Design a protein around this ligand. Structure first.
Ligand SMILES: CC[C@@H]1C(=O)N(C)c2cnc(Nc3ccc(C(=O)NC4CCN(C)CC4)cc3OC)nc2N1C1CCCC1
Length: 127
């Protein structure tokens, strides 16, 4: 309140490469998390105006969400799987910083994180 613009998702200046890890992150990791029962609050940027939380972007200076992550993968924005994994981690950490521990939103993030960590453990060897 006001809302910032959403995170950048494309840069045609950035070099691009398709790898088996980035593919997996899109087609497996993002897809499985997106479809989870608890995914819906994490599918787009926090609208702090709509939610009437004017402090949200006073506290969270590195917002991230799965809608942004989806687009960055589509746009070949990431050179490395680690860049993408960091964005997921940022999304979770933001939720943990902003919200009271144990609140339902935190439990929802925790569940998605547990699933994300399981999929990351199965990240294919770079080929
Ligand atoms: C930004 C803080 C935190 C967070 O970290 N994320 C990511 C977040 C992302 N998106 C949402 N979204 C919504 C949250 C609540 C509602 C909603 O309609 N709540 C009803 C209000 C009336 N009540 C009788 C029934 C419940 C709708 C939402 O989006 C349309 N909430 C989030 N929260 C929550 C904000 C309030 C709890 C914590």
């Amino acid at each position: 309140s006001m809302n910032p613009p959403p995170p950048e998702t494309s840069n045609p200046n950035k070099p691009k490469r398709q790898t088996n890890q980035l593919q997996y992150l899109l087609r497996v990791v993002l897809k499985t998390l997106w479809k989870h029962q608890f995914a819906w609050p994490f599918q787009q940027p926090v609208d702090a105006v709509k939610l009437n939380l004017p402090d949200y972007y006073k506290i969270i200076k590195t917002p991230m969400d799965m809608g942004t992550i989806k687009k960055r993968l589509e746009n070949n924005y990431y050179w490395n799987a680690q860049e993408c994994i960091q964005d997921f981690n940022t999304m979770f950490t933001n939720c943990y910083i902003y919200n009271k521990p144990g609140d339902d939103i935190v439990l929802m993030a925790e569940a998605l994180e547990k699933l994300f960590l399981q999929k990351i453990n199965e990240l294919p060897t770079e080929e």
